[PDB]
C-alpha cells in the first residue's frame, strides 16, 4: 500500500549471524589469544539472517568477486520459528 | 495522566535517607557544642534539624539577606560546600565576646559585616571545620578547606543550575532566650559517589573481613554463565527487499577483516573465523579495552 | 497483507527530535558548562518524529503522570517533505 | 593542533532528541490525528544531544526570550555510553 | 511591515545581559568605597546604577559640558575606555579636601578645571583604576592604563562611528546631601571577544576540570561523521544550451591539474584522481591551510 | 519566449561531479598524503552534471585533443531524480 | 513551457547593487578607517538588480518590519541597457 | 614596493551591494510593476563592498551633501570570508 511505500523510503539494517554458543564466564577468562571456540551450528547449515536483531530468513555464504554474500534459501515461517525458539 | 509539558517545571526524586550523614551531623553537633562552650564560656544547646533535600533555588530563597556564606571543599571529593551562619548568631557571638548580657533584643540592620565580625565568624568557622572533619573521619577520610566568604547569592553558583538537588541540614543553637541557627549545605553530586556508604547504616569496621567478603563474592561470580554471539557482518537494505526474500537470492556483504564477539550487545573481543574440529572457530586477537 | 503481519512481529525504533541547528567547530569549542545554544525551531512548533532516523510525522509534547509524551498532529506528506528537505 | 583549527572552519550539525520509543507498525496504523504516544524517557531527565546522529552530551531544556535552548549538564563518558547502548 | 529606508536611521540589538560585568562593578564599588573613605576621611555611599547599552552619540549628548573625561586602555584588549567624573563630584571632593563643610550649594560655572582640580581628579582616578583593575582580576587578567584627560566630546572619537554600541554603568556617590555621580563607558567591540565569559554567570575556578571537560568534548566530537565531495571541474555555459541537452552532446571542459575536496562547500585539500580497487581514488597532496 | 532570450544573456555555471561518499571526521584525520579514498559510484557510470549545484543531466567523460569533455547521455527526469534523492 | 517549469526547480541568486565608482589604487591606499567614498549614482535613483551579475531590473529601497526590501520600478529593456552599457 | 606603485597607476572599480536573495523564475514572472521583493540582509547591517566582484570590506551608508557614501567599518578577514561563503 501507500504506507508500504512510505516505509520503503526508511532504510533498515540487516544482520547475518554465523552461529551461537553458550559457555561460562570462567571459560571465557580461560580463553587467550589464538583460542578455539566451537559453535552449536554444524557445517553447511544455512546461516541466520536478522533484521534489527529479528530472524526473518536463512541463506548460504557465497563470495562475490572479493566480497562475501548470502544466498537466501528458506524462511522462518511461524512453526519453524516457534520450534527453534523453544530450543 | 496526560499533562502538557512546561520547560520551566521539574519533579522530585523519592527519598534518599542518609543515616550515616545524620550520625556525622550528631557527632559534629557534640564537638561543636564542646567548642562553643570552650569559646563563649557559656554552655550552648545545639539541636540537629531534619535533613532536607530540595533544589538549590529553594534553599537560596530562604536565606536572609545579607547572610554569611563560606565556601569549603571536601577533599578528595570534587565540589564546593557551603556553611551558612545567620546574622542573629553572629550578633549573639559578638555580644557575648564583648561582655554583652543579651538583655537588649537585636535590631534589624541589613548591613555588611564588619571586619571584627568577620574575625568572629572566622573564629567560629575554624572550630566548626575541625568538628565536621572529625565527625566525617569516623566513616570516611575527608579534608575540609575553606575557600572564601561571601554575603550574597550573587557570589554563589556553587551549582551549575539553580534547580540542582542539594542537601541542607539545619542546626539550632540556644544559649538562653537566643535561638540562633546555622546551616550546612552540600550539593548532591558531591556526595553521589558515596551514596551506598551513606544510605545503609554503618557496621563494624572489619576491614579484613569485608575484603575477604568481596574476594569470596568475586570468586563465586567467576563461575557464572553467559551467551557468546559473534556477528559475521551487517548489511544495509530496505523493507521492500525483505518482502521479496526467496530461495536463491544473493545479497552482497562486505568482507569482515575481523569478527567482533558481543555478549548481550557488549563487544568483548575481535577475532577471525576459522574451521577447527569440524566446526566454526574464532581466533581471538584483541580484547575490547 | 500477510507480510504486513509478518513485519508487525518485527519491532522498530522511534525517535523524537526537539530541533536542529548549525554552527562551527570553533563555536562548539568556545562552549563550556552551562552554555546556551539556540535551535532553528521556534516555540510551540510540532516536533519531528523519526523512525530509524526517517521523519514520518509530527507531534506535540505532553506529560503523562510523570512521563513525557508526544501528541501526533500532522504528517510529512511528500510535498511538505520535499519542501522541508529543500531547506 | 593546527588540524583542529582546520576542522574548526568546517561546520557541523547538532541534533537534540526528546526521547525514543518502540512500537509495532500495526499500532502506528491504529494511530490517528490527535493520538497520544508515550516515550521511554521520564519527566525532567536530561535530553540527548547528538552530533551527526552520535550522542556526545546531555542537557536541559530552557527558553531564551522566545527560543528554546539546551543547558548542557553531563557527558556520555565511555562507561555510561556503553551502559546505555547495552540497553 | 514594509517601510521606507532612511540611511540616517538605526535599530537596536536585543538584550546582552552581563552578570559578570555587574559583579565586577559591585566589587569595584566596594573597593572604591573603601578608597574614598580612606581619602576624604568621611564615609561615602556608592550605588551601582543599572548597566546601559546605547549608541555612542546617545551617551555623549547626556554628558554635561564641560566634563572630565579620562582615556584608559584595558590591556591586552584593544580599544580605549573612558572614565567620566561629573563636575559636581569634583567640586565636592575639592571642598572636602580644603576643609569645606558643604553647607554652601555649588554654583554653576561651566569653566575649565584648574590644575589643582586636575590633581584632585588624578588622585581619584588612580584609586578608581586600582579598584577596577582588582575587580576585573577576579574573572580575567586585565591592566588599565590611563592615556590622557579631555574636557569635551571634541577630543573624543574613542569610537569609529557615533552610532557604535557602548556599555555605560552609572554610579551614584553620596556623602550626605551630596548625590554626585560618575560613569564608566566601554565600547562593545572591546568586550566582544569576552562576550561568552561575561554573559553566563561565573562558576568555580576548576581550571584543570575545565581543561579536562574541553579535552573530553574534543575527543567525543572527533568521532563525528560528514560528507566528502570532490568537484572534478566547472564549466561556464548558458541556460539555452541546458534546454538542449541531449544524448551524445559533448561539452569541453578544462583539464584539472588538481582535484579540490570540499566539505559542505568548504575546501579541505587538493588531490589528484586515480583508479584503485576498481573505484575512483584521490591522492591527497596538500591540505587547505 | 522573450524572457528566455533575456535570461539567455545571463551566463550560468555548470559543475561536473565525479562521485560522492560518506565518512567520519576521524577517518579523514587518519588520511594522510597519498591516501586512497573510495567513492560510491562504480566504473563506467555516467557522472552527475550540476548547474549551480543542481543536478540536471548525466554524461560520459571524453578528452578533446588535450581537454576533458563530458558526453551527455541521459536526463534526471522527476521519477529518477526523486528515486536518487530518496537514497 | 515544460522546460521553464524544469528550470523553475533550479534556484537562482539575486544581487542588489547600491552604486558604482572608479578610482585609482593609490587613492584606495590613501583611504583609511572612517574614510568617505562617493558613488556615481545620485540620491533617490533606482538601484540596479542583478541576477548572477547580470542587470535585469531596477527597484527602490524599502524596509519590511526590520528587513530591507527592494520595490521594483522599471526594467532594463534593450535600448536602455545598451545606452547604460555604452557609458 | 615599486610594482605596487606601478599598479597604483592602474584604476580599479569598486562595487557596493545592498543585499542578495534567492527566488524561482516563476516568482520573478509573477512580479509586476510596484512589486515588493525582500532581501536576506537585515536593517542596519553593514553592506558588502566589492572590487571587480570580489568582497574586500564592509561599510555603512551615509549621505554627503547630496551624494550617498559608504563609511567603512570592518574587513572580510579569511575566517569570516570562509564562514560567509560556506553559507
Numbering used by the authors:
A (entry chain t), C (entry chain p), D (entry chain o), F (entry chain n), G (entry chain C2), H (entry chain C1): 51 to 137
B (entry chain s), E (entry chain m): 34 to 322
Copy out sentences from the published article reporting this entry, exactly as the authors wrote them.
The cytoplasmic C ring of the flagellar motor functions as the switch complex for the rotational direction switching from counterclockwise to clockwise. Here, we present two high-resolution cryo-electron microscopy structures of the C ring-containing flagellar basal body–hook complex from Salmonella Typhimurium, which are in the default counterclockwise state and in a constitutively active CheY mutant-induced clockwise state, respectively.
Initial two-dimensional (2D) classification analyses of manually picked particles revealed that like the MS ring, the C ring adopts a 34-fold symmetric architecture. The reconstitution revealed that the structure of the C ring consists of four subrings: the inner, upper, middle and bottom subrings. The C ring in the CCW state has a height of ~160 Å with the minimum inner diameters of ~332 Å at the inner subring, and consists of 34 protomers. Each protomer is assembled by FliG, FliM and FliN with a stoichiometry of 1:1:3. The bottom subring is formed by FliMN, FliMC and FliN. The head-to-tail packing of the αtorque helices in the upper subring generates a periodic distribution of positive-to-negative charges along the CCW direction on the upper surface of the C ring.
